Amino acid sequence: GQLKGKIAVITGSTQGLGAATARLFAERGAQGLVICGRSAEKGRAQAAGLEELGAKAVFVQVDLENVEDCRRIVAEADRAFGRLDILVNAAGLTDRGTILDTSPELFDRLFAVNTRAPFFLIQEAIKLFRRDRVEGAIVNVSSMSSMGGQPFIAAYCASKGALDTLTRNVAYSVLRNRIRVNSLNIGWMAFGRLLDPAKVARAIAFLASEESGLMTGAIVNFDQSVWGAYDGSPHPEKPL
């Protein structure tokens, strides 16, 4: 019942968190889902799975580094369903590198998928929300690393900090539109365990649904850790 009648785009949805999210959305009555990713086969398999749960599903084969592919995703929601209600930016790359050895190519892929793709998916979703007078809801999946984070993922952490800033900027800009933009800042996914995507999906659904009311611009930490809290202040064992 919770997402009855709703049309959603969810990225990173051929597997992992995006697929878990799409499955939950269908289980909760989503009318139409646009899913996307690189693998045609996994995409086709997920779409048929979503249909058996009750959602019309469209799969879009994409490379999120390509801004035109980003635009096509949202175009496909309009093509198939004529409207959009929800965008969930759940795709992400987690390529590693330190400040010393990260290549420009690696830096650029991280920003392209983790920051630029959300930017242009958000751009397109808000154009549909405005056209059809929809109180849209956007959920960005960011990271616990977004404040500063770990030396082995320098560029990755920066790409997520950019996303948090963007979440707040966009939320502010569309306040009077009643378009809501919130972030869920997650730990590492599958005591201490890797996070369960099915439970993460539940938090996303909250933020994507009427249950979170007017909430917008929130940065919601989701992890068994707490920014600025510790037993002793963290520091490296060795010089870099």
TrEMBL record:
<dbReference type="InterPro" id="IPR020904">
    <property type="entry name" value="Sc_DH/Rdtase_CS"/>
</dbReference>
<dbReference type="InterPro" id="IPR036291">
    <property type="entry name" value="NAD(P)-bd_dom_sf"/>
</dbReference>
<feature type="domain" description="Ketoreductase">
    <location>
        <begin position="6"/>
        <end position="182"/>
    </location>
</feature>
<protein>
    <submittedName>
        <fullName>Versicolorin reductase</fullName>
    </submittedName>
</protein>
<dbReference type="InterPro" id="IPR002347">
    <property type="entry name" value="SDR_fam"/>
</dbReference>
<dbReference type="InterPro" id="IPR057326">
    <property type="entry name" value="KR_dom"/>
</dbReference>
<dbReference type="Pfam" id="PF13561">
    <property type="entry name" value="adh_short_C2"/>
</dbReference>
<comment type="similarity">
    <text>Belongs to the short-chain dehydrogenases/reductases (SDR) family.</text>
</comment>
